[PDB]
Design a protein around this ligand. Structure first.
Ligand SMILES: *[C@@H]1O[C@H](CO)[C@@H](O[C@@H]2O[C@H](CO)[C@@H](O)[C@H](O)[C@H]2NC(C)=O)[C@H](O)[C@H]1NC(C)=O
Ligand SMILES: *[C@@H]1O[C@H](CO)[C@@H](O[C@@H]2O[C@H](CO)[C@@H](O)[C@H](O)[C@H]2NC(C)=O)[C@H](O)[C@H]1NC(C)=O
Ligand SMILES: *[C@@H]1O[C@H](CO)[C@@H](O[C@@H]2O[C@H](CO)[C@@H](O)[C@H](O)[C@H]2NC(C)=O)[C@H](O)[C@H]1NC(C)=O
Ligand SMILES: *[C@@H]1O[C@H](CO)[C@@H](O[C@@H]2O[C@H](CO)[C@@H](O)[C@H](O)[C@H]2NC(C)=O)[C@H](O)[C@H]1NC(C)=O
Lengths: 50, 221, 197, 116, 98, 34
């Protein structure tokens, strides 16, 4: 998404995203959630269980 | 000259063990033993930013790249300083109420003047305490923090515990201090170690002289 | 316990210190460490692998230094926790398991017994203690001469209300008429100091 | 001088006192302490139990309207034992009390994969 | 750009100096805390009350403990019971009268 | 969290800790110091 490659399980996210917001980022700078470029649907980012 | 030798293991004494014989002392002596422990280390606080950068904006920008690295070290130093104050407070403040010895020294002749703080000195500390203090002897952001408890306070805390032991015996540690004659308190100490109280009363004059001599020897040492 | 969380505050503080160390590692990942971007992926996406590695090397040195500092803090905290655990084990062995003659080892006053209470990452000891409630002052004699012979109480010390002489234990006031069985006879009155008749 | 902020709980009060370490008040409610110049705290002759430790025997509490004040911390009530050569004190009555001591046996276990 | 690279080498050493200083202070503080805990235990079981522990406060039988203020330290003076003159006597575990 | 930072559960469960404390407590109440 937006030139960033990450591996994680993809699920819809309950948290609302404002129109300006395209991504949700943790303090650690890891991207918790992203909004799809093709369609504006909020998706939670969950890393595959380890 | 410097010499090389096998270190001694101490003088060797052979006990005369016997099935039908026992050794019981006919005479005893009273001695004072001194043990010193450092309660706290000197509190020091160092500013990591001042040490790393000499008032340089470019250095500060590089320090921002380090980020939390500078903050954790300063936080740890502040914690060490708080810990030293906590250790000092716990050891010195073991008595709920400050205690003062009575002006008349009716203690059976056992002098306690040299262990007691001196009023004439501007800071009230014992002569023995003064000897202990005498024997013990920047712009980079390194700073020294004064202890929460002042040295005079520390002396007042030791004096309160000392007064409770001298006048109330062990009652002050258990709870409210209870007055007891010092000679009777000494008999209680003998009863605790199992020596008969009567023996202490018979040798009370000898014990008082031995105690005074032992305190004097400690000051000389 | 309900009114103040300060008593469990020290246990909470230990949990907070562990959480702070994890939070510090999260903050470190945000730090650039001299790299063009804090995120490893951002450097990899915009730079060739050989070029990206040099920026990674700078992040790795900072991250390794952060891990070493975190491990050192955890080891020092573990050593402090181990010392507290050793003290707790000593308290359980000499208070909960058996009565302690040590003074103030388990609470102010004379410890009788202790009760262990489960706590998160912690142990709580409740110790029953003996504390005097009411105290009175009585005239006292080191020894008493029935016939010019000094008497010392086998148990307790002489006390006097002001009319009679009694022998009672130091811990609690239980006045008893003085008897030859109660007080052993040793020495003579002249040798004893402060002796009464 | 390092700036140390003496602050009571935010819910309790928003008032703050500023302490500057090892500097006179002129370099920067006026008090001078061994730790440094004290501002936002008014010196009180009366001694009170320490609430916040400023340092150097000086402590800060919120007291009457209530304001942060600077005072020498109390050493506890002063009691003189009535020591007597011929008099002893023996308790006529006692009380049974339970004391609580809490120690942290273990710290939360954390495992970090350095490689990840 | 060039000055910052040289400053960065100094920063890494200076940050290392603070990290080493903090680690040494923490280890010293832990040793000091253990000594303070031992001192607190001695004050509670010796100055406050008589100790039945053997050699807890000085060689011989401890009677009472005295504390003297010292800079960053505590001093305990303990009155102890030591035999001065000893003699040998014949002894019996038990004696028979009747 | 997802950085490889993990929390490990203790070998002794809180209920097990309560059972241990209870065993010591019961011994003090019924058997005293024996
Ligand atoms: C404390 O020490 C002083 C000085 O040694 C004792 O006072 C002496 O007492 C003896 C016996 O009565 C006299 O012969 C000396 O002349 C006294 N000296 C002085 C300077 O007064 C005192 O009795 C001891 N006990 C006390 C009161 O603490
Ligand atoms: C028992 O031991 C004590 C202590 O050694 C003896 O007291 C000593 O007596 C000599 C001779 O008068 C003095 O020089 C010492 O200074 C004394 N020491 C102290 C500190 O008291 C005592 O005389 C001995 N008694 C017996 C039975 O011999
Ligand atoms: C208390 O009783 C004792 C013992 O009867 C008295 O001591 C005697 O005093 C007389 C007269 O001085 C002597 O002749 C005896 O030899 C002493 N006996 C001994 C060895 O104790 C003492 O005087 C009495 N005190 C009072 C105040 O009556
Ligand atoms: C000294 O002790 C005697 C002990 O007999 C006290 O007399 C007793 O006082 C109590 C309380 O008033 C009475 O119940 C007893 O009946 C009294 N006994 C006798 C024999 O009279 C006497 O009051 C005491 N003095 C003081 C000052 O307490």
């Amino acid at each position: 998404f937006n030139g960033l490659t990450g591996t994680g399980v993809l699920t819809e996210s309950n948290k609302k995203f404002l129109p300006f917001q395209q991504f949700g980022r943790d303090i650690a700078d890891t991207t918790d959630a992203v909004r799809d470029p093709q369609t504006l649907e909020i998706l939670d980012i969950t890393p595959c269980s380890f | 000259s410097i010499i090389a030798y096998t270190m001694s293991l101490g003088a060797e004494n052979s006990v005369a063990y016997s099935n039908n014989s026992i050794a019981i002392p006919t005479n005893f002596t009273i001695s004072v033993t001194t043990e010193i422990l450092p309660v706290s280390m000197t509190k020091t606080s160092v500013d990591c930013t001042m040490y790393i950068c000499g008032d340089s904006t470019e250095c500060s920008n590089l320090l921002l790249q380090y980020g939390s690295f500078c903050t954790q070290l300063n936080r740890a130093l502040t914690g060490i300083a708080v810990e030293q104050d906590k250790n000092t407070q716990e050891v010195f403040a073991q008595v709920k109420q400050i205690y003062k010895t009575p002006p008349i020294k009716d203690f059976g002749g056992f002098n306690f003047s040299q262990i007691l703080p001196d009023p004439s000195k501007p800071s009230k500390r014992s002569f023995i305490e003064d000897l202990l203090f005498n024997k013990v002897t920047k712009f980079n952001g390194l700073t020294v923090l004064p202890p929460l408890l002042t040295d005079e306070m520390i002396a007042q805390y030791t004096s309160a515990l000392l007064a409770g032991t001298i006048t109330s015996g062990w009652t002050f540690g258990a709870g409210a201090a209870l007055q007891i004659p010092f000679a009777m308190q000494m008999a209680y100490r003998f009863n605790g170690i199992g020596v008969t109280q009567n023996v202490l009363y018979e040798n009370q004059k000898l014990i008082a002289n031995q105690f005074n001599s032992a305190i004097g020897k400690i000051q000389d040492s | 316990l309900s009114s103040t969380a300060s008593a469990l505050g020290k246990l909470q503080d230990v949990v907070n210190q562990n959480a702070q160390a994890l939070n510090t590692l999260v903050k470190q990942l945000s730090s650039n460490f001299g790299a063009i971007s804090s995120v490893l992926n951002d450097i990899l996406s915009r730079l060739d692998p050989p070029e990206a590695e040099v920026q990674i090397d700078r992040l790795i040195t900072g991250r390794l230094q952060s891990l070493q500092t975190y491990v050192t803090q955890q080891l020092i905290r573990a050593a402090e926790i181990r010392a507290s655990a050793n003290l707790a084990a000593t308290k359980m062995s000499e208070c909960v398991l058996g009565q302690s003659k040590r003074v103030d080892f388990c609470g102010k006053g004379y410890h009788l017994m202790s009760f262990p209470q489960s706590a998160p990452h912690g142990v709580v000891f409740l110790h029953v203690t003996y504390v005097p409630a009411q105290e009175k002052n009585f005239t006292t004699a080191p020894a008493i001469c029935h016939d010019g012979k000094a008497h010392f109480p086998r148990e307790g010390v002489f006390v006097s209300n002001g009319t009679h002489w009694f022998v009672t234990q130091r811990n609690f006031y239980e006045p008893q008429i003085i008897t030859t069985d109660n007080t052993f006879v040793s020495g003579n009155c002249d040798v004893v100091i402060g002796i009464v008749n | 001088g390092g700036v140390s902020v003496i602050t009571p709980g935010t819910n309790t009060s928003n008032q703050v006192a500023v302490l500057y370490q090892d500097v006179n008040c002129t370099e920067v409610n006026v008090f001078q302490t061994r730790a440094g110049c004290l501002i936002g705290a008014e010196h009180v002759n009366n001694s009170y139990e320490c609430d916040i430790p400023i340092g150097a025997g000086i402590c800060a509490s919120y007291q009457t309207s209530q304001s942060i004040i600077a005072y020498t911390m109390s050493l506890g009530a002063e009691n003189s034992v009535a020591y007597s050569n011929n008099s002893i004190a023996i308790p006529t009555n006692f009380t049974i009390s339970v004391t609580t001591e809490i120690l942290p046996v273990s710290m939360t276990k954390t495992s970090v994969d350095c490689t990840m």
